[PDB]
């Protein structure tokens, strides 16, 4: 055949892959965590968005930390040979490096480690996408006026917010990040490489959202999401 190029992940396996959505809305009272009003809007938007990208979507609601770990363990032990990619969406309370089950926290690294190149062989060399709507701390953005491949290769973490910062969720509309992400996937998944889609999400969140609060501490705050890419190739959700 003619000249071949190798710059983009193979996305024409028989299946696009799984999209696991963990939607934690109601937390055990002893944790002292509030209910995450609006997260069902996020979860439904994500389900439809990734359905249209031909992912096998599984929605899970109100999982304990133990159920989160077992679910991700079990999913990492499936045979993904016929799947192009893997997507996991986490919607919950969080801190830097941490996502909350309904009864307590889970280390993000414990979740993602199940899918390391050496621990999930049927996803080796395939893009593993983790999309995280959760706080990464308590800072507020005031804004300004205008040995063959590494085991950590081929992961992408699409964080809703910068390191150390709160993340914003509207109780009526859903979270700023998930809203924008779904809208940009809807508009551009058949046209743009994934990093360029996520860059549009960055701009949409940064420019179109600002908090409104009766509490001066939390009023008029801004947010920028945070793309963390260990991918080794371009990622297009379509193929030729």
């Amino acid at each position: 055949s003619g000249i071949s190029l190798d710059n983009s992940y193979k996305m024409d396996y028989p299946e696009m892959g799984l999209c696991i959505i963990i939607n934690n809305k109601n937390f055990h009272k002893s944790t002292g965590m509030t209910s995450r009003s609006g997260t069902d809007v996020d979860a439904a938007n994500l389900r439809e968005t990734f359905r249209n990208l031909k992912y096998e979507v599984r929605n899970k609601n109100d999982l304990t930390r133990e159920e989160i770990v077992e679910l991700m363990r079990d999913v990492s032990k499936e045979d993904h040979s016929k799947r192009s990619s893997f997507v996991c969406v986490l919607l919950s309370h969080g801190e830097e490096g941490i996502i909350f089950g309904t009864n307590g926290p889970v280390d993000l690294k414990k979740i993602t480690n199940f899918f390391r190149g050496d621990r999930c062989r049927s996803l080796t060399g395939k893009p593993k996408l983790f999309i995280i709507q959760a706080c990464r701390g308590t800072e507020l953005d005031c804004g300004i006026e205008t040995h063959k491949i590494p085991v950590e290769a081929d992961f992408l973490y699409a964080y809703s917010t910068a390191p150390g910062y709160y993340s914003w969720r509207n109780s009526k509309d859903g979270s700023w990040f998930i809203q924008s992400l779904c809208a940009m996937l809807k508009q551009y998944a058949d046209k743009l490489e994934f990093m360029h889609i996520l860059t549009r999400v960055n701009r949409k969140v940064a420019t179109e959202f600002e908090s409104f609060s009766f509490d001066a501490t939390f009023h008029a705050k801004k947010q920028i999401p945070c793309i963390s890419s260990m991918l080794t190739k371009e990622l297009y959700f379509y193929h030729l």
Binding site: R36, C135, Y166, S167, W168
Partner: peptide, 4 residues
């Protein structure tokens, strides 16, 4: 608007 609420924080996570």
């Amino acid at each position: 608007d609420e924080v996570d």
